[PDB]
Structures are given as C-alpha cells and as structure tokens.
Amino acid sequence: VNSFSGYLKLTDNVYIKNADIVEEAKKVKPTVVVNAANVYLKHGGGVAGALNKATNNAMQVESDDYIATNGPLKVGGSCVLSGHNLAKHCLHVVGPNVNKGEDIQLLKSAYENFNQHEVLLAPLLSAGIFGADPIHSLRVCVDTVRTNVYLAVFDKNLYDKLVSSFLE
Ligand SMILES: O=C(O)c1cncc(-c2ccccc2)c1
C-alpha cells in the first residue's frame, strides 16, 4: 500500500523521516524495502540485522539460498528477494565499505539499483559500519536516484544534521 506519512520533502523524488525502518515497513506496507547488505547477505547487524530479526530469520534463510546459486554479490550490486512480512520485495543493496578501502565512487552504482523500483523505503547506503559520511551518501542518493525514495534515519542527531545540510 506504500502508506508513507510524516516524510519531509528534500527534492521532488527524495523524502526523509526520523524513524526506525522496521517500524516504517510495518506501518507503510511498502512494495520495496531496501536492505543495507554485505556481499554475503549475512544480516548480522545495523539495518540488515534489524530487518532480518523482524522477519524472525525468514530473510536470512532466503538470502543463503540466493548466495548458493549466485555466490557473493558485487560491491555496488543488488538482488531482489522477498520482503516477507515487511514489504513485497527486499532490494538487498551492497554499498562500498570505505573502512576496507572499497571505492566511494561505487556508492553511485549502489544507488543506481534504486532506479529499478518506482517507490522504495530505504536507509542511507554505506553509512554506519560501511564508513561513508551519511550526508555525502544523501547527496549521492539525490544525484543518482530519480525514482521515489523514502529514507528512514534512526538517529535524531544525524537526521537533524542531514536536514540542516540539505535545506539550510
Ligand atoms: O502484493 C502487492 O501487490 C503488494 C504491493 N506492495 C506492498 C505490499 C505489502 C507490503 C507489506 C505488507 C503488506 C502488503 C503488497
């Protein structure tokens, strides 16, 4: 049903809310929730851990089965798997891990995957343990994605910084 509420317009196609993406997926019933994935689709923490836990490990069993056919994803790559109880689809997207010297230029490639989906509920890619500046990631989102993105940002202090950088 894609019932997004309380999202702040940043651009004509990029929206942002200070919210837990799991709680968002349960209220919004989005067609697509984006996972901040690693190449092995091992959902051990952050957004991936959160989404998987909310599926009571359904996502992790499907993910393994995919990895068995594919081997690992490419950095900048994605797959479309079931959203389980959270969404029709989960778009698992691998942003570069700049901690491991993966090139920040691959963040554009990661966001380009969003353009395959009319409307997405999504985190910022390559933030947190992936080590990219989240405000940089938002700029790459805005520059790259032309389909309708609804970004959920868990942390209020980071949310305010993001909105201050974008609108002030
Ligand atoms: O089956 C569909 O066409 C569909 C499309 N978008 C969202 C959903 C959905 C997503 C989460 C919960 C319940 C329903 C289903």
Curated annotation (Swiss-Prot):
It is found in: Host endoplasmic reticulum membrane. Responsible for the cleavages located at the N-terminus of the replicase polyprotein. Participates together with nsp4 in the assembly of virally-induced cytoplasmic double-membrane vesicles necessary for viral replication. Antagonizes innate immune induction of type I interferon by blocking the phosphorylation, dimerization and subsequent nuclear translocation of host IRF3. Also prevents host NF-kappa-B signaling. In addition, PL-PRO possesses a deubiquitinating/deISGylating activity and processes both 'Lys-48'- and 'Lys-63'-linked polyubiquitin chains from cellular substrates. May form homohexamers. Interacts with N protein. Inhibited in vitro by GRL-0617. It catalyses: Thiol-dependent hydrolysis of ester, thioester, amide, peptide and isopeptide bonds formed by the C-terminal Gly of ubiquitin (a 76-residue protein attached to proteins as an intracellular targeting signal). The lineage of its organism: Viruses, Riboviria, Orthornavirae, Pisuviricota, Pisoniviricetes. It is a multi-pass membrane protein. This is Papain-like protease nsp3. The chain holds residues 1025 to 1192 of 7096 of the full protein. Residues 1-168 form the Macro domain. It comes from the Viruses.
